[PDB]
Write a protein that holds these residues in place. Structure first.
Motif, PDB file in Angstrom:
ATOM      1  N   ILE B 121     -23.587  -3.001 -46.312  1.00  0.00           N
ATOM      2  CA  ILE B 121     -23.091  -4.357 -46.484  1.00  0.00           C
ATOM      3  C   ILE B 121     -22.034  -4.692 -45.432  1.00  0.00           C
ATOM      4  N   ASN B 122     -22.137  -5.893 -44.867  1.00  0.00           N
ATOM      5  CA  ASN B 122     -21.197  -6.398 -43.868  1.00  0.00           C
ATOM      6  C   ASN B 122     -21.072  -5.450 -42.675  1.00  0.00           C
ATOM      7  N   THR B 123     -22.194  -4.831 -42.327  1.00  0.00           N
ATOM      8  CA  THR B 123     -22.284  -3.871 -41.237  1.00  0.00           C
ATOM      9  C   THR B 123     -23.307  -4.359 -40.219  1.00  0.00           C
ATOM     10  N   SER B 124     -22.849  -4.711 -39.021  1.00  0.00           N
ATOM     11  CA  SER B 124     -23.725  -5.341 -38.035  1.00  0.00           C
ATOM     12  C   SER B 124     -24.789  -4.384 -37.533  1.00  0.00           C
ATOM     13  N   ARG B 125     -24.405  -3.118 -37.426  1.00  0.00           N
ATOM     14  CA  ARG B 125     -25.293  -2.048 -37.007  1.00  0.00           C
ATOM     15  C   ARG B 125     -24.890  -0.790 -37.759  1.00  0.00           C
ATOM     16  N   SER B 126     -25.857  -0.165 -38.416  1.00  0.00           N
ATOM     17  CA  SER B 126     -25.648   1.095 -39.110  1.00  0.00           C
ATOM     18  C   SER B 126     -26.528   2.157 -38.503  1.00  0.00           C
ATOM     19  N   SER B 127     -25.938   3.292 -38.145  1.00  0.00           N
ATOM     20  CA  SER B 127     -26.697   4.392 -37.555  1.00  0.00           C
ATOM     21  C   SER B 127     -26.510   5.644 -38.387  1.00  0.00           C
ATOM     22  N   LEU B 128     -27.606   6.353 -38.615  1.00  0.00           N
ATOM     23  CA  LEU B 128     -27.585   7.657 -39.263  1.00  0.00           C
ATOM     24  C   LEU B 128     -28.016   8.690 -38.246  1.00  0.00           C
ATOM     25  N   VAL B 129     -27.135   9.637 -37.946  1.00  0.00           N
ATOM     26  CA  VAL B 129     -27.352  10.586 -36.855  1.00  0.00           C
ATOM     27  C   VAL B 129     -27.292  12.019 -37.374  1.00  0.00           C
ATOM     28  N   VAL B 130     -28.429  12.705 -37.395  1.00  0.00           N
ATOM     29  CA  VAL B 130     -28.443  14.118 -37.739  1.00  0.00           C
ATOM     30  C   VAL B 130     -28.177  14.869 -36.438  1.00  0.00           C
ATOM     31  N   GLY B 131     -26.886  14.975 -36.124  1.00  0.00           N
ATOM     32  CA  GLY B 131     -26.420  15.493 -34.859  1.00  0.00           C
ATOM     33  C   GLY B 131     -24.923  15.297 -34.821  1.00  0.00           C
TER      34      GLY B 131
END
Lengths: 234, 234
Positions: B121-131
């Protein structure tokens, strides 16, 4: 006869050579380097089809020895545009070979295209368009899937090419392995530039849902759906 | 306590407010506008988590009334980087809210990330990084999935955000509906810029296969796999 040329001035000479393999002497390219071929039927069987884009004689992979295409007037096509101008849908069940100079190819058929175990040889970019090309006073301006709800189907035996692949249709239903250098799938009711930039879009009256089963063997995959409300099912 | 901050100088203050909802007073952003938060555990439950990026008090969606984050020193974070520095994998089973000024967020966890009914929510870009993030003298240079074979899992209850979504991992296994403005999935063993441009790649010793079931509700989907030999299964 899977491939039947139109009777008019964009109909290429099509012949069958032993095995059932079709050889298409594509029409003279225009000044933009486009060989614009029109067909009453465009279907490729297991024996395959060879598009003669050769300036000198040689060995084709699917049809053995072929002479040069004299229609070329010394200049090979940059783009082989294959346009179905009837109501007949297309079935591609075998390999399409560009003989001679590597080129881009486009198959446009607004009635539907099915590819099941089909492939492309010596083709830098292959596009399948369930829609029509757009022309302005003889010049190719792009493509349209507007006012169309028909399907690009890819069967369980898949699609293979060492080059780039574009899949353009109101909706796509893929059930097999797609192998390509890059895969670009653009769904919905759209107008496109010659390079498949999306220029405009319609919202379909009913959902245009696309489905991708199977697999994609490609380092770069892009799927763009402009049908607001419709989804991409995996 | 799903979220447990690191004991060190990048550990934010984390508190639970009635319902089990976690509130994270993110650490002071650096000069690049990055709030670099380090965690022993990062997990979001159904009650959700609220990252306080607010310069003034107000109503949050998940945690009700909150005061401003005084750590911000008058300037909100541009990027909230959440880095797991332990061996513990992450499970996201609820919504992550940026309270206050909209921001980008990244969760990095080289041990694995699972998202099942999670959202942003209210997040322009969300990234999930397994690293891991890459730093040079305190400055963020990008991210790495090198030397890693762990999984980014997306469960049957899916993932939702109104913003952009990046999924970065050696391999991805998705079983639900992914809803986002745009979806970018980058698989294999790679180094990345801050903007997830691929800068280098390794070939894994064994296949790193990714699987996408379910669906993607997004107008723009990109899947890039650098693991030569490995495929994308649909």
């Amino acid at each position: 006869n899977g491939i039947v040329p139109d009777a008019g001035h964009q109909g290429p000479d099509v012949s069958a050579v032993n095995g059932g393999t079709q050889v298409i002497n594509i029409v003279t390219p225009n000044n933009e380097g486009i060989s614009h071929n029109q067909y009453q039927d465009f279907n490729v069987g297991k024996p395959g089809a060879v598009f003669n884009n050769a300036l000198e004689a040689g060995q084709s992979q699917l049809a053995g020895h072929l002479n040069a295409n004299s229609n070329l007037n010394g200049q090979a096509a940059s783009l082989i545009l294959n346009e179905v101008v009837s109501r007949n849908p297309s079935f591609l069940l075998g390999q399409s070979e560009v003989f001679g100079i590597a080129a881009e190819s486009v198959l446009s058929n607004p009635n539907g295209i099915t590819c099941d175990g089909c492939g492309f040889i010596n083709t830098s970019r292959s596009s399948l368009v369930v829609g029509n090309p757009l022309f302005e006073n003889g010049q190719l301006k792009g493509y349209s899937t507007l006012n169309n709800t028909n399907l690009l189907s890819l069967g369980k035996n898949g699609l293979n090419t060492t080059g780039l692949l574009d899949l353009i249709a109101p909706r796509i239903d893929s059930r097999g392995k797609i192998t390509a250098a890059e895969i670009s799938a653009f769904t919905g009711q759209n107008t496109f530039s010659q390079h498949f930039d999306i220029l405009s879009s319609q919202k379909p009256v009913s959902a245009l849902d696309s489905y991708f089963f199977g697999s994609m063997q490609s380092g770069r995959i892009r799927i763009i759906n402009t049908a607001e409300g419709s989804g991409v099912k995996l």
